[PDB]
Amino acid sequence: DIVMTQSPSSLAVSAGEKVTMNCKSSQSLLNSRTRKNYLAWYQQKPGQSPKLLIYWASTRESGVPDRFTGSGSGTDFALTISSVQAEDLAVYYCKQSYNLRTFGGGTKLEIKRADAAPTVSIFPPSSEQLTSGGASVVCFLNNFYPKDINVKWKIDGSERQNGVLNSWTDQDSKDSTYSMSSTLTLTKDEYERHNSYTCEATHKTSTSPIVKSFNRNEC
């Protein structure tokens, strides 16, 4: 039961960079009858199934861009991308098929790009939700870079920490940005006791936050 490793665990690369990632087997994967190494590379884009890139260590599957090259022999293998493109964000897995099958643990490739500030939009609780007693205030932060960002909620000018949950999309395959939602959830009765609700995003792009706000009583 052959054991596979990969390194680095992640890499962050700009479009046009040359990158190499490594795979190691516990046993030689060289089949002496065929003189091929039974090691394959798979690309798994976010939310998608794995896709075959390379088999027999170095044979490119039909359709695969020629920027992908597999190399190595025996117990050491590599996948090299000559010039990374935005669409190449993925987790890359090696897999032996010399005796049974085993995947490595993956190398996550992320894309570095220029810093971009978010576009912010705020939404009051819907009237359907309010009718049944809950109040979720939603903030979207769109198309920004890098991923980490500070989002702060204020209610009548006072910071609110409790009840906030934040979720990020996978990196975009065209523009290499992230988006994220921030949802503040209160009871109707609490929501109705205040007026101004504000979402403030502070991004390494500026000391001045990007802000959106509404006043419940103007609804």
């Binding site: 075959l52 088999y55 049974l100 099958r101 085993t102 979207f140 979720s167 988006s179 939602s181």
Partner: protein
Amino acid sequence: EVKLVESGGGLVQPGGSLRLACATSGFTFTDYYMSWVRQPPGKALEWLGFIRNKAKGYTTEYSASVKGRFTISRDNSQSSLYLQMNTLRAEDSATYYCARDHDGYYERFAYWGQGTLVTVSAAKTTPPSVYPLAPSMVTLGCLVKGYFPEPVTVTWNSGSLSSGVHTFPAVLQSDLYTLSSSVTVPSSTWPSETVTCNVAHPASSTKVDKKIVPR
């Protein structure tokens, strides 16, 4: 075209069992080994086992992780692969993929299905409540709250709109998931053109459409 389509996943109680199916087409099924592979949310692929081709007598092999507890079989008249998964526990929660394996010549998994999500939990099935999030570009959204299990499928306009959509990963709390989805369109088009959130939650047999009204 080669096609592999998994089914039979979903929610299962601890200690239960499931039979996954993989319906294949577009190749001579009997010529191929067929594998099952799983992936816990956010973690690495794990090969589970295979069933060999006709040349090798359709014999099976399994990873140590599931050997003795899972059983792979195939129906060569119906070109279908199965995984009987017994005695389920928390570590069995994952996306399960079928893959077309070895033919006797090439050593590759050339085709994979879309995957079926298996959730091992005693928490109860609950349909979402879907709420509209109303406003050069304009951003609209829907909030998909308080459902269990995953997945939901969210589209924009029965799928009329994609380039500008962000459907956020759900978050679980007190046995329920919530997510949201945003979509951005030209204001030259809104509101002339209706924008509509489509939310499917097959576990609960919920399919809802929520029109976004200005407001």
